[PDB]
Design a protein around this ligand. Structure first.
Ligand SMILES: *[C@@H]1O[C@H](CO)[C@@H](O[C@@H]2O[C@H](CO)[C@@H](O)[C@H](O)[C@H]2NC(C)=O)[C@H](O)[C@H]1NC(C)=O
Ligand SMILES: *[C@@H]1O[C@H](CO)[C@@H](O[C@@H]2O[C@H](CO)[C@@H](O)[C@H](O)[C@H]2NC(C)=O)[C@H](O)[C@H]1NC(C)=O
Ligand code: OLC
Ligand code: OLC
Ligand code: OLC
Ligand code: OLC
Ligand code: OLC
Ligand code: OLC
Ligand code: OLC
Ligand code: OLC
Ligand code: OLC
Ligand code: OLC
Ligand code: RET
Ligand code: RET
Lengths: 296, 296
């Protein structure tokens, strides 16, 4: 199948490679196997099941709500590209230093990172407005991905430095994302809504934490994982990161909006100290509408 | 200097190229000249002058205000990389389809796009909060850059499609950025502040409009421009897009904050109709504090 030079002869006892002068790029590095047929088979199964979940979430969302649909929209377009051109440039970039860069992965990330982080800043769906913190989250997260993608394209000590720059931005993002979830938890009603927020927190930090781990493990890092191996790992954390989290999001949103339909918008003033933070606690009781300084 | 294969022999009347079997990537496409010495000279002069402006803006900003400094911070780091490794991977990506992709350019864009667009959503510096519109601006702008970078890495009809997808996202961004500037203009005091907002609008749409134009003109498009030619064009719109716009921003911010120091925060209710929009007009007169439905 390949549309770089794949046919060559060894000359002078393999010290010289001779290739047709047909204008095609050539590098032996590009031709290294992507992994075993078993790894490939496992990856194609998880991909179909990802396509199925992406398809069902979209139709389900068909029955405010723009962030969840979009992530499933991007995810379906992703699978049609994977199905036709997963290992074709520029879904994979084959570069002059011999690297394989999965641009397909990083592109999806940059496209939906605003969508996800806006959704992070809007778990309840009630806010019309976003604080200063949201803005720092977006700037830090996009820096992370840009430094990391630079690290994937680089080699040796230059790859190390850009990874480190990505990590520094990443830590700032993780720190502030933690505060958001804390605020969300003490904002939503006391019952099922706080189970779902807790569910979303776990999914978010485990799935987001696994990305730098799979970077260091993959061809972009210490090459422990094969390409199919990395795909399989990505499909699992992909399902968690996108489909499942947006599904939990939509679910949470429904619960909160139905709370306004039954009890109404009854806010409180839970002053947290996890510092000197403040929160508007939705409650099911009209009576409860006052300042609860819960210093953590 | 190059760290891809640059030394080769033609064999069988130039139908075969023979190269040392030293593991280096090889492509004739990579070795195409970057342009004339005159183009290169012009580019190195504009770069130094860009370094000088980046350096003076930073020290000037040393005497709230985080978005302007950052763009100058990123811009200085950019020049030190240009000075040492402008044509080294991954500042330029040399790929298997023979493309040269100026990753250095697109990386800077993704890094500061949140910073600039947050600053777009905060011209006065008085807001602590951001509307729904800000969030659509960030999602659409990041999609634009991601589709466009994909188009730069691709060829033939696949490059056409991703460019078109970038343009569709871009138009949504331009449309909404236009409304922001309209709101800003009717929010700020009547005097010098509305001159500066008008200045920032011109700089923003001319400089931002020139990027897709320079894409279509450069190696990423119809290859009208050489690489040094594209650098020279980029230095001019770079100075406008980053240094000058942030300088005008900081200037505007100072003027607005000094208005609060002298007259105080005296808002109004200018109801625009450019639709049914609304605005809080800062005025220098305490008397003026009422609803002015100025249907445009
Ligand atoms: C051709 O190159 C090959 C490299 O494999 C040479 O074969 C080996 O020779 C070295 C001795 O320098 C040994 O260390 C290896 O054990 C040899 N065999 C293999 C299978 O690697 C071969 O000697 C070279 N021929 C000439 C004329 O230079
Ligand atoms: C070697 O290839 C070259 C290609 O340049 C051949 O030279 C040219 O031959 C063609 C005829 O097929 C003409 O159209 C050109 O005008 C020729 N000259 C140049 C300067 O391009 C040459 O004939 C080939 N030799 C062999 C034995 O195949
Ligand atoms: C808060 C969440 C916690 C989780 C956060 C994840 C942190 C993992 C970092 C590891 C440091 C090790 C250094 C990594 C350097 C990468 C560069 C690299 O792979 O170098 C290429 C090598 O030189 C040629 O094979
Ligand atoms: C509102 C602001 C107005 C300004 C907005 C800018 C719009 C310019 C678009 C041009 C369309 C022409 C099509 C462009 C297609 C690009 C793909 C391309 O270059 O194709 C490679 C070619 O096939 C091999 O050389
Ligand atoms: C868990 C991954 C999905 C299920 C396993 C699929 C797989 O890779 O099994 C192939 C088999 O071992 C043939 O060699
Ligand atoms: C969002 C991510 C996009 C990745 C880009 C993947 C787009 C796949 C295009 C593959 C390509 O270059 O096509 C080659 C050509 O069709 C055969 O000759
Ligand atoms: C905050 C204070 C400034 C330090 C910030 C970034 C360090 C990276 C510097 C840029 C050099 C790039 C070289 C590389 O990544 O290797
Ligand atoms: C430490 C590394 C830099 C971390 C990445 C940048 C953090 C975002 C930033 O600069 O935002 C701060 C601003 O003051 C908000 O108002
Ligand atoms: C306007 C661009 C900056 C000034 C012109 C520099 C330049 O390119 O002039 C070189 C000269 O023509 C030698 O060949
Ligand atoms: C922000 C943009 C970053 C572009 C990355 C540019 C970083 C330049 C690194 C150049 C490189 O790969 O260095 C080769 C090596 O130092 C010689 O053997
Ligand atoms: C809104 C309705 C859906 C259409 C949206 C995007 C068009 C691009 C489809 C993705 C195909 C990629 C192929 C390419 O870019 O060539
Ligand atoms: C038409 C192409 C798609 C344009 C790019 C996407 C626009 C952003 C979007 O989907 O945001 C709308 C949302 O409903 C805001 O609340
Ligand atoms: C498609 C959905 C998601 C949630 C993608 C997320 C990607 C990341 C969280 C990536 C993180 C990185 C870090 C923290 C540092 C190294 C470079 C990475 C970009 C891999
Ligand atoms: C570094 C500062 C700035 C303001 C960079 C801006 C870049 C753009 C506005 C790019 C726009 C593009 C468009 C509209 C469509 C084609 C692809 C591009 C990414 C080149």
């Amino acid at each position: 199948r390949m549309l770089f030079q794949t046919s060559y002869t060894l000359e002078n006892n393999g010290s010289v490679i001779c290739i047709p002068n047909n204008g095609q790029c050539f590098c032996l590095a590009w031709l290294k196997s992507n992994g075993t047929n078993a790894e490939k088979l496992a990856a194609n199964i998880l991909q179909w099941i990802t396509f199925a979940l992406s398809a069902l979430c979209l139709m389900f969302y068909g029955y405010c709500g723009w962030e969840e649909i979009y992530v499933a929209t991007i995810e379906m377009i992703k699978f049609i590209i994977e199905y036709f051109h997963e290992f074709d440039e520029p879904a994979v970039i084959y570069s002059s230093n011999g690297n394989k860069t999965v641009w397909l992965r990083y592109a999806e990330w940059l496209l939906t990172c605003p969508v996800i982080l806006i959704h992070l800043s809007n778990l309840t769906g009630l806010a019309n407005d976003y604080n200063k913190r949201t803005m720092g989250l977006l700037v830090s997260d996009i820096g992370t991905i840009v430094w990391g993608t630079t690290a994937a394209l680089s080699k040796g000590y230059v790859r190390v430095i850009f990874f480190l720059m990505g990590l520094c931005y990443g830590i700032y993002t993780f720190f502030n994302a933690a505060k958001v979830y804390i605020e969300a938890y003490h904002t939503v009603p006391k019952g099922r809504c706080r189970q779902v927020v807790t569910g979303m927190a776990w999914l978010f930090f485990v799935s987001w934490g696994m990305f730098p781990i799979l970077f260091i493990l993959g061809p972009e890092g210490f090459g422990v994982l094969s390409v199919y191996g990395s795909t399989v790992g990505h499909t699992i954390i992909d399902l968690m990161s996108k489909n499942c989290w947006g599904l939990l999001g939509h679910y949470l949103r429904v619960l909160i909006h139905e709370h306004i339909l039954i009890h109404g918008d009854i806010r409180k003033t839970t002053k947290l100290n996890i510092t000197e933070i403040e929160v508007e606690t939705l409650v099911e009781d009209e009576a409860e509408a006052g300042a609860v300084s819960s210093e953590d």
